[PDB]
């Protein structure tokens, strides 16, 4: 729609203005149960020919269920926690005796109901399949006859539709061992997911967003195995709640800004360390340093608030005016002169320095731009591919207006070489005090001698 960014040249960085955050803030839990029967021995005399698929399918079912029975750059400032917290609590509640019996009894005919547990938790119950009816009505009257013989093989294939899903279940919990990301469609189909979105206590615009983005919430959601006793095998889905929806959230890319000093290895330079997503949730902003935890889909981002920074609303002030007396504005400084480039949503920012061939070319008119020196940035609808150093990259080709603001080489504000290049956590205040104290030390050394 109206995607934009303004590449600052004062500090070479991209701020992708214009998005809607759709942040998750809570965990919605729900128990999904399958009912299933303790089949005894097949009770068949002879082998026949028609009854071969049934016998091996049921043996596969027995093996599957007995196997399930036998089952039971700002990252250093980022924390760690238990993502599976509510669902394991619900399962541990279900470990109490006589609790899952209430689910079994209450959900006898209704597809979805609500039960209240021993700790005031009353989220939801749901039944995914009805193997009681099909097994006790369409299979066992036939398979347990004298000298058994099925009526036809066509009665078996619909059984496949009731069994293969379960088989999916088994080898997707024997591989990932209880916790599965993303949730497969065999735990929860798309239509059944649409049913469940119409069930949890959220407002209807959240329901519309989840219905429009079923695969995204399917990607984000978890699954945890609960108890298996009384043959009512079940699991808790921990699909995300979504607190704030539709506030601006920008992606800050950074690019190096290093002087093209003739003497190699003596070019000190300072580059922004603020990569990631900044969404203005409530009166503050939430910062995600991990771009992999966040996901993007058609202007619509989706990211997790557990590994989030509740940074104050004054982040745009340092974003516009980098030399402001209100924010720390963390910067990494080093003498490295590395030709590196990044791709924003509506452009490519190259920072190739020294002897490095730098070309922006399209497939229509051959080459169209050559980057000599300094940090440079091209709009997405100006170029197609960029070659820097020995590597090629491709800019995004989605519609949006992008502008380049004329900034300044801030690296020339400071001394040509006083900057230390052996620190990995620094801000403008700390670096400024380091420069002040080094200047004080050198004038003291000059005054004493």
């Amino acid at each position, epitope marked *: 729609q109206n995607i934009t960014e303004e590449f600052y040249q004062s500090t070479c960085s991209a701020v992708s203005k214009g998005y809607l955050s759709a942040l998750r803030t809570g965990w919605y839990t729900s128990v999904i149960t399958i009912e299933l029967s303790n089949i005894k021995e097949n009770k068949c005399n002879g082998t026949d020919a028609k009854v071969k698929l049934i016998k091996q399918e049921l043996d596969k079912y027995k093996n599957a269920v007995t196997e399930l029975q036998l089952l039971m750059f700002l990252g250093f400032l980022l924390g760690v926690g238990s993502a599976i917290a509510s669902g394991v609590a619900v399962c541990k509640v279900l470990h109490l005796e006589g609790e899952v019996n209430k689910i079994k009894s209450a959900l006898l005919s209704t597809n979805k109901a609500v039960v209240s547990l021993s700790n005031g938790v009353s989220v939801l119950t749901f039944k995914v399949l009805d193997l009681k009816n099909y097994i006790d009505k369409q299979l066992l009257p036939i398979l347990n006859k004298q000298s058994c013989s099925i009526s036809n093989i066509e009665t078996v294939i619909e059984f496949q539709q009731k069994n293969n899903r379960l088989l999916e279940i088994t080898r997707e919990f024997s591989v990932n061992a209880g916790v599965t990301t993303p949730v497969s469609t065999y735990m929860l189909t798309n239509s059944e997911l649409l049913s469940l979105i119409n069930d949890m206590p959220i407002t209807n615009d959240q329901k*519309k967003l989840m219905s429009n983005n079923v695969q995204i919430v399917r990607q984000q959601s978890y699954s945890i195995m609960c108890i298996i006793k009384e043959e009512v095998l079940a699991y808790v889905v921990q699909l995300p709640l979504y607190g704030v*929806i539709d506030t601006p959230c920008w992606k800050l890319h950074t690019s190096p800004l290093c002087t093209t000093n003739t003497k190699e290895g003596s070019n000190i330079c300072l580059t922004r360390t603020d990569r990631g997503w900044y969404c203005d949730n409530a009166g503050s902003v939430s910062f995600f340093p991990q771009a992999e935890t966040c996901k993007v889909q058609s202007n619509r981002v989706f990211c997790d608030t557990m590994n989030s920074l509740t940074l104050p609303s004054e982040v745009n002030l340092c974003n516009v005016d980098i030399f402001n007396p209100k924010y720390d504005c963390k910067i990494m400084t080093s003498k490295t002169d590395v030709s590196s480039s990044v791709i924003t949503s509506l452009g490519a920012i190259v920072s190739c320095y020294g002897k490095t061939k730098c070309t922006a070319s399209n497939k229509n008119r051959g080459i169209i731009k050559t980057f000599s020196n300094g940090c440079d940035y091209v709009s997405n609808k100006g170029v197609d591919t960029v070659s820097v150093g020995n590597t090629l990259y491709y800019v995004n080709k989605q519609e949006g207006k992008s502008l380049y603001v004329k900034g300044e080489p801030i690296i020339n504000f400071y001394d040509p070489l006083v900057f230390p290049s052996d620190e990995f956590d620094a801000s403008i205040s700390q670096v400024n005090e380091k420069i002040n104290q080094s200047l004080a030390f050198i004038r003291k050394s000059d005054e004493l001698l």
Partner: antibody
Amino acid sequence: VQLVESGGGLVKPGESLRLSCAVSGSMFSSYVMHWVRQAPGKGLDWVSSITGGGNYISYADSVKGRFIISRDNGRNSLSLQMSSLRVDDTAVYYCVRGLSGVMGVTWFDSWGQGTLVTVSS
Amino acid sequence: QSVLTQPPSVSGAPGQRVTISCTGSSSNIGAGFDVHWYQHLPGKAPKVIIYENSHRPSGVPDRFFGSKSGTSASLSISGLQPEDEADYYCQSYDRGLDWVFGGGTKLTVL
């Protein structure tokens, strides 16, 4: 944090007109907006909702498409269109600024000063 | 007309605790949705008294105490003070009429 808005008056029913909301929030982009109305006699009732950019419009069942809600983020303001006017429309109309819920819900926090809109005769 | 039903025929002298109860169907309140109570003193615009029945906003007394159970919510005022003449509300998110508001109860002193 306070709000100011205008647009009330005595207008014949049936025709469309403009309601404006001119909230002076210094960061009016994140908070969810609703408009409600209070008709004298009966109780107050929610009318319309909008969320940030304005891609999740919702209306009360009394007006399906009758009211057209919008906001402009850069001009920190909001607009509503009375496509149709029935005698029941007369009420004191309120902007209301809600915060983000712990689940998702609008808290309906600090409100506007209210504007009377009258449609009779 | 609201699914939120509460008796708007309540009054009490200052000094005692007054309990207000509003009930709803299965789809509102009882479908895991919270309740928000406001006030309507004449003149200055209505403001929230209590939200989701437990946490309270900045300038409020401790008199207001909110609670819910099943499909029914309540708000009590211990030791009524004189200027609490207002019209107090309830709120939920009925799956039909989206943001449904209660009729509102007129509380006055005697």
